Subunit: 326 residues, 4 copies
């Protein structure tokens, strides 16, 4: 009963239940050649959603993404391209959600992307130094300028998202259509409890990220930090610490148990985790990440796992994780 | 007492009581040469309204229409060009009334038409997957961008049209000026009963289509499906089935009777049917269709029939049709 | 105590108490060479206001005006250029105050004028076929598009002007700043009684036209229709009839009497009439007309007459005219 | 506890506590070479705020400023460029806060600056001939046109600033973010008493100017008008009169006393005065002025003085000045 394509929240924007992101990989960990192959595989498999950000690889991720789109020549109208704005430089005025950086940042992202507009522009995170009204007016402005079709939030609290809606309705501006939130077996609270309320109240959709907790859910770290793994990359010592932390090892213990259900269902752990992220209608789309073609094809195969996630299967997983939100 | 030119609803847009459409014919059933001749004949006879759609002939109808306008060099200010948006591609995001497709779709139609803007952009049909607010904001945006002068609805229910007005007045956006509805002797309810209410309440005008029920009213199918007829064209098996259906034959029976009044008045059946469509002020303009010059000139001659449609004549027709709405 | 420059109504637009119009003369009755000289004389004498219209000489007036501006190279910021829109073609959709013609009409005027925008765009007259809301939205749109700085009305009733303000305040649009009304010794009611109310209520300014009643006030028709006079021009038989009419001769009788006061003051009749038009603060600016340099220099000399228009002088004129409004 | 960078009022625009202005110097008193050096020194020292005006050196200040920015090639996103509009020509319509001059004036400033937009456009002073609504709509328009990111006021009373906010909230326009006010030891009332109220009430920020009272606070006029001093420049006889005035000499007397505290703290008088201007959070940024590199480097050194401005030090200064506002 799964519908591969669904509306992003209550907006009219239709997206595939699975998207492909560019964090770490594009313009960084992987070659442009591998990136091209990954996007082609995604696109050919129905995926129309591709996420990026001005900060990814200091802007190179957007460059690679734009190059592929141009080289492949896919119709712009058949793609949903999203980017996020917060950190776009070292200068004081090159970061934040001020009108100045919103406009300068998106303009610079579009130039790198070789695109006239993105379908959704996201505030990559909350800005405690900029009043909501200024931010909402700036997002509304770029949409009115044809630089984006819609806008959204990322890593914002339920209250801050409602605040953006409040400002939009008071000054007759455009409200946000989606919140890009982290969601995986070890981070469920926000997406399972809070976001559903925002959907029914103000139509906000949930586009989730890091469905494998940066690859931790794959269980490839059951025995240390494998070579070439994200956790072994430069600038990702923070990930390695989380993996080697006390809590990071307790997660591995639970994973081994989840692995049992995986093989018992005839799928891999990553496929179980990803399918798990889509088990509820509440999630509009799960943004995937992959360093090679084997991972992506495996991940996409998660769709076939959905039908096997019965009530019993879900309860067993909850008993194992032991973190089912109230 | 007929006024050849009238306002489209309560808007200031003045249109001829007869327009020329491009469905099936332009870029499809007829040659560009024949299309040029038909439009010239229309224009030279006072017709200033020409309708098309992104979906007609996969966009070719708009191409032919734009070519003629350019080749003939008529002043853009002397023309009322309308197009409709819903289905503009095979991709998921290439259909619907989302802001994304509204903007991408109209932009693509304008490029094909070689025009900077259309006078009216229509939503070709209702979109159950896009909230009215998003659609109304998108229509308002393209009007503000100078891509269209006004917007309208097509195949929308009275309630959905009122809903668009509601959103427009609540968020101070631009309301629709017209609804493009089917109207002929075998489809009267909506146009005769509901649309008049929308005109007096929210100024919505009625621009009607298929005045001959795709040619069925001409009675050329009194004996099967004549060669080259629309019903015998590829992709129009649906029309042939309606003609050969039980109800389709009962219509022919009534037509034969209507034919009596036609010849009794000194006009053809198509002229009687078309003049009938304009008998009431409620209809701002009737969109004509034609595959050759004989049909168009005949159709235009319907204007001369109007004066003969007395109360008695109208009552006789009602008795024959037996479908006068309450 | 006269201030040569004053605000046009309550707006911030500052105009000279005297402007130079282009009706009949520019691109028509006079040569481009004479037009250039007249504008230069005006500009050099402090006049910054120049009025035209899409209908004047079928658009040639705007062409000549734009040529002079370009040839002389005066700073655009030192000029106040106004044009009026209603009749811009023979086609049905080429006339009126519909959004379509407002945009097409002004765009075409600007191209002829070789200007990016006019300071004020006027609706040349009321349009009974277009709802006020559509007209006000269209004027607001062109101002927002940078095609005009402000907009105004011409030949509108006090109630229709208040209606435009009503729509502007209800839908948060831009209200009109001025009404271009006829004003001379034989047409005082509207300007003296009604316009002052609009100024204090909604800040509307009064820019008056035909201060010499098309030249009739000069008294050059005291003995028929002199050669080369406007009344003897082709297409102005209507003016000749008004002059030769019973009322037209009764005006001449009164003029002869006014002539007495003129010579008694040391000025010409035209100078007395023009100075009379500016005697009250209510009039922001009087638009002058002239076929040669002698008339213009004479007319401009009306400024020196103002100081002599005492209460007694004004009362004597009222006794003669006998048309002082209540 | 000083934060070099702070928000300009409640807006999201982040500026350095010290800015560099161009009045008198750029394109005038100093060479383009010296101007380039001064800006480079400022920029390299963290200063991101540079102020100018259409009136400075008849537009040359903006030309020099734009040349430096272009020659140095600093990222536009790392700069906060502000300009002020009021007097942009000799013609009547070339001055004021009318929509006409706002648009023409800023457009001309941007061309001279070789920039697409300024971060903040200021009304250089109040305009008693233009209604607030017109001015606020014009500022909102240029911001919506991408010609400026924000707008502000300069030399406006607290009530006039609140009036601009009132109009903005009534017609849903954009309110001002900052007021550029004079602030130095001999002008404290407005900035110390009134502006703080506007900050808490409507978020208006305080960007101050002439922190050395045009150089008077430096005490270089303790013995007349030194050569090359601003007071000895052409067109600045007004400054010399203020210095040589009775009150101007009484200020010198107080300065000599302040000098005691300066040397007693280990800093110069200008450093004490400038640091004094930043002692309170109320001031977002102090705009500096300098004719040579020695002055600028000295002035910037005022930051190190801030830590020494204890309560006692501030009280001693108040006792000396004897002008502490109520
Ligand atoms: N809004 C925001 O702030 C954020 C948004 N995002 C978005 O979400 C997207 C996805 O996030 P991401 O963290 O990459 O997602 P995941 O948590 O799914 O991690 C994907 C990474 O895990 C590894 N992996 C993937 N599949 C497999 C597999 N089958 N077997 C083994 N290892 C596998 C790969 O890394 P390796 O091979 O190197 O181990 C890959 O790069 C991003 O690209 C971005 O677009 C992400 C973070 C934040
Ligand atoms: N908003 C919407 O969804 C829709 C809008 N429209 C608009 O309305 C327009 C008119 O619709 P359309 O269905 O073409 O109109 P009609 O119902 O009037 O049918 C016209 C067709 O009937 C035949 N015909 C026309 N005149 C004669 C005649 N005198 N004698 C015999 N046959 C005749 C021709 O087909 P043939 O010779 O092949 O038999 C011609 O193509 C369209 O072109 C389009 O612009 C149409 C449908 C939907
Ligand atoms: N909003 C609207 O609908 C209208 C606006 N206007 C505006 O107002 C302007 C002025 O109107 P207009 O009717 O021309 O003004 P006047 O009533 O002042 O008439 C001017 C004409 O009278 C004659 N004249 C002028 N000065 C003298 C003189 N000193 N001695 C003798 N004859 C003289 C000239 O015509 P001749 O030498 O041929 O006798 C000249 O063309 C127009 O150009 C236009 O811009 C005008 C009409 C309508
Ligand atoms: N909004 C508005 O209406 C106004 C805004 N402003 C803005 O504020 C900025 C600063 O104003 P400004 O009056 O120049 O500032 P100051 O009051 O600080 O005076 C600076 C001037 O004083 C002298 N000076 C500076 N430092 C020293 C020093 N250490 N020792 C001795 N003399 C020194 C220099 O002049 P010299 O060497 O010639 O003596 C220099 O040009 C302007 O450039 C402008 O951007 C200014 C006025 C009005
Ligand atoms: C998609 C939309 C309009 C286009 C856009 O850029 C952002 C949004 C977000 C909020 C949506 C809004 C609508 O279109 C109407 C909605 C969906 C509203 C939330 C409640 C709402 O007002 C409602 O429930 C319809 O009545
Ligand atoms: C034409 C118009 C404005 C231009 C446009 O793009 C769309 C519309 C549709 C609705 C119209 C509106 C008007 O202009 C004023 C009308 C005609 C309104 C319906 C009721 C109305 O408000 C009225 O009755 C006047 O008072
Ligand atoms: C000039 C202006 C704004 C710019 C414009 O394009 C048209 C107008 C016309 C109406 C003016 C308006 C104002 O600026 C404020 C005014 C002048 C208003 C009439 C009453 C008003 O609201 C008032 O009295 C101030 O309080
Ligand atoms: C920065 C801002 C919006 C961007 C802009 O161009 C100008 C302003 C000035 C007024 C600010 C406004 C806000 O962003 C919200 C503020 C800061 C408001 C003053 C009160 C306010 O409404 C408030 O207190 C938040 O609730």
């Amino acid at each position: 009963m799964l519908q591969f394509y669904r509306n992003l929240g209550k907006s009219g924007l239709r997206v595939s239940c699975l998207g492909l992101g560019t964090w770490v990989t594009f313009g960084g960990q992987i070659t442009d050649e591998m990136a091209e192959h990954l996007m082609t595989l995604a696109y050919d498999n129905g995926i129309n959603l591709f996420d990026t950000a001005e900060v990814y690889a200091a802007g190179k991720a957007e460059v690679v993404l734009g190059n592929i789109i141009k080289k492949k020549g896919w119709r712009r109208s058949s793609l949903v391209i999203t980017t996020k704005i917060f950190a776009g430089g070292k200068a004081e005025t090159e970061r934040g959600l001020s009108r100045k950086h919103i406009i300068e940042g998106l303009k610079a992202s579009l130039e790198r992307l070789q695109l006239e507009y993105v379908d959704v522009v996201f505030a990559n995170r909350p800005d405690p130094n900029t009043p909501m009204e200024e931010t909402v007016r700036a997002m509304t402005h770029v949409i009115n300028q044809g630089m984006a079709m819609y806008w959204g939030t990322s890593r914002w609290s339920s209250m801050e998202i409602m605040e953006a809606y409040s400002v939009a309705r008071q000054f007759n501006l455009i409200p946000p259509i989606c919140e890009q939130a982290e969601y995986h077996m070890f981070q469920r609270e926000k997406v399972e409890v809070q976001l559903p309320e925002l959907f029914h109240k103000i139509g906000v959709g949930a586009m989730t990220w890091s469905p494998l907790a940066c690859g931790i859910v794959s269980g490839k770290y059951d025995s240390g930090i494998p070579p070439y793994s994200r956790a072994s990359l430069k600038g990702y010592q923070w990930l390695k610490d989380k993996i080697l932390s006390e809590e990071g090892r307790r997660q591995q213990a639970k994973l081994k148990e989840l692995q049992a259900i995986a093989e018992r269902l005839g799928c891999t752990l990553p496929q179980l985790a990803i399918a798990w992220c889509l088990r509820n209608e509440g999630v509009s789309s799960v943004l995937l990440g992959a360093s090679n073609a084997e991972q992506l094809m495996e991940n996409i195969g998660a769709i076939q796992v959905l039908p096997k996630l019965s009530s019993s299967i879900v309860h067993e997983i909850d008993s194992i994780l032991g973190n089912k939100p109230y």
